[PDB]
């Protein structure tokens with residue numbers, strides 16, 4: 001399970017954004033104060049909150065260099081608050097869009113290897129992340145500067161996919177595995193593939209802009225996502241972004257292929 | 261001395277604040293992100309003090325010194341083009357994070373400020389405007405294991421061109437020997453900034469009137485003791501009215517890595 005955090009120990013600071021049924025804030029935790037990130041769940045039903053706890057538990061009961069730490073959950077009136085690791089530079093997508101055209105291929109390859117690494121760890125433990133996207137990739141060390149390499153940390157997947165509505169699942173296209181449109185570790189290989197494209201297209205994922213019906217139509221008509229600009233990831237993404245879950249490579253394979 | 265920048269190459273954006281005879285803006289250099297220090301309509305002596313400042317920064321290179329791209333000199337306009345530092349002035353941040361800034365964080369800033377100032381010392385160059393405002397935070401060092409990373413800004417219009425009223429406004433950072441009409445002056449600035457850091461962006465006398473401030477220096481009064489006794493000796497050594505009695509930055513840098 002997960003560690004319990006009293007309301008007294010946490011301080012809510014500036015708003016960083018909104019997740020699926022959550023509001024992300026900067027914050028402090030008394031342990032010596034630590035800079036935390038608070039994911040404040042919306043007033044919710046028992047099934048939604050349980051999906052939130054299950055997510056805390058996944059992140060609490062694991063340990064990897066490229067996985068964000070979960071301090072615990074605080075249960076305050078209608079709100080539940082996940083207390084998570086504060087990462088220096090925040091979401092990757094935001095940064096890649098800000099640094100558009102000035103992000104070198106080697107930088108992107110390091111991020112890929114690191115993301116495949118953390119996802120291979122969850123694979124060997126037979127655990128599903130269920131929300132691999134650029135936003136959920138946080139930059140602990142920036143790596144864009146002469147003589148620097150990036151250091152990423154994969155965020156909690158938020159409210160478990162199982163509790164999400166169809167409308168909510170559609171919003172996750174192109175990262176959402178098409179079999180999840182109507183929970184296997186096979187789903188994270190599609191997420192990894194779609195994120196690999198988002199990284200290549202400097203934080204601009206294909207279909208992001210398109211309408212929910214346009215997005216739903218793409219999956220219904222079994223259409224395939226664009227090819228990455230860099231031909232190094234071209235084979236890997238095509239292998240990952242297959243509609244047949246069994247046809248997706250293992251992260252053990254992906255991790256090997258990335259070293260070449 | 262200084263690189264010249266054409267007016268066509270620069271785009272002015274959001275006003276960030278005002279300096280001594282300047283207005284600070286966000287800007288674009290043809291398309292890189294910079295900070296434009298737009299000098300007020302000025303006399304030739306004021307503009308020359310501005311160029312001298314550009315030259316100081318232009319002809320130097322240090323990890324904890326802000327970069328100066330050059331000066332745009334067109335007709336009545338004088339614009340210094342400089343490095344944009346992500347989180348901006350330290351004083352603003354320290355006041356925002358008041359009570360939640362740990363001592364170790366402040367020591368790191370101090371060591372970094374003493375290092376950039378030791379570099380100018382070994383080159384026998386005067387900054388002349390060491391204050392909280394002129395320390396810019398490139399990295400906040402908020403995450404565990406992460407440390408802050410500061411960059412010292414240009415000192416603005418050289419102190420030599422400032423009026424008495426303008427010099428009085430720089431109390432307590434201004435060296436008292438600079439009030440009427442040396443690298444020793446930056447040791448006082450460093451000392452007064454070390455107090456401002458300790459008092460979480462609240463420097464002593466900042467609230468007091470110009471006459472109250474002038475009176476403090478005239479009557480040879482000494483600035484308060486820092487809350488943290490680690491910097492207590494260092495600040496007392498730095499904030500002496502005898503310029504020759506101030507430690508070298510070589511000494512300060514040693515003392516910082518021992519207390």
Ligand SMILES: CNC(=O)c1nnc(NC(=O)C2CC2)cc1Nc1cccc(-c2ncn(C)n2)c1OC
Pocket residue numbers: 016017018019020024037068069084085086087088089090091135136137138155156
């Ligand atoms: C587990 N740790 C984190 O989640 C986390 N950790 N650190 C930062 N640091 C920072 O931002 C540093 C720059 C100030 C941001 C983080 N999250 C984050 C921030 C903003 C929006 C979202 C969000 N969640 C869902 N959506 C759609 N968007 C979000 O979740 C990933």
Ligand SMILES: CNC(=O)c1nnc(NC(=O)C2CC2)cc1Nc1cccc(-c2ncn(C)n2)c1OC
Pocket residue numbers: 276277278279280284295326327342343344345346347348349393394396413414
């Ligand atoms: C060389 N580079 C700089 O000086 C500089 N670089 N980056 C920022 N970034 C930002 O602000 C990011 C946070 C939004 C601020 C900077 N200057 C600055 C901003 C506002 C006021 C003054 C100012 N100067 C004199 N006074 C009284 N106040 C000022 O000069 C130091």
Ligand SMILES: [Cl-]
Pocket residue numbers: 140141142143
């Ligand atoms: Cl970094």
